[PDB]
Design a protein around this ligand. Structure first.
Ligand SMILES: [Mn+2]
Length: 203
């Protein structure tokens, strides 16, 4: 059903912002296990949907496969997006920048807001820039929850166009407890061409 997608770049392509050993473990170990356990939970009538569509249909799948698919289909969708919105000062332009200035006042203030949501995510989770009713918004989720899941499951909603992984596995080898330093580094590896593309597709 699902497979591990290939990275668009080498494991060391994001140095020194994210370390190569982390990129390799994160991808070949953590994401792989999300795929494995998602596939095992789908082996069911929902195994033909792409992961992005499945996680919109969780309140629908059996009551007892729901936790495993949420966590694991969630983890697959999230990490799959995550590799694609990174790439080797760095900022958006065009319509996405205009919408950022409209929703948050400025690129610099959007960053602050995105960082703050990432920092106050207590425990494991993600921070997201989403499109909701045509407008940009910053939110976060717990664990492998995704805003595509809806308000009831995820506690928030919208279509993610960018996300940052703040599970500790995402930054502990390079930054230990220093999440904020990880978050500042993350800005240097965002691929805003890809994010601009996702914004066009979702507005
Ligand atoms: Mn992760």
């Amino acid at each position: 059903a699902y497979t591990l997608p290939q990275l668009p770049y080498a494991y060391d392509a994001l140095e020194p912002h994210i370390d190569a050993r982390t990129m390799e473990i994160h991808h070949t170990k953590h994401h792989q296990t999300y795929v494995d356990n998602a596939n095992k939970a789908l082996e069911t009538e929902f195994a033909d949907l792409p992961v992005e569509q499945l996680i919109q249909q969780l309140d629908r799948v059996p009551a007892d496969k729901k936790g495993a698919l949420r966590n694991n289909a969630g983890g697959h969708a999230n990490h799959s997006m995550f590799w694609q919105i990174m790439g080797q000062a760095n900022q958006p332009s065009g319509e996405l920048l205009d919408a950022i200035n409209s929703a948050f006042g400025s690129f610099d203030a959007f960053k602050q807001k995105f960082e703050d949501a990432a920092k106050t995510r207590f425990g494991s989770g993600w921070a997201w820039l989403v499109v909701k009713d045509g407008k940009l918004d910053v939110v976060s989720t717990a664990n492998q929850d995704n805003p595509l899941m809806g308000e009831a499951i995820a506690g928030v909603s919208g279509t993610p166009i960018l996300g940052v992984d703040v599970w500790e596995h995402a930054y502990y080898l390079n930054y230990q407890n220093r999440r904020p330093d990880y978050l500042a580094a993350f800005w240097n590896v965002v691929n805003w061409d890809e994010v601009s593309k996702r914004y066009a597709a979702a507005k």
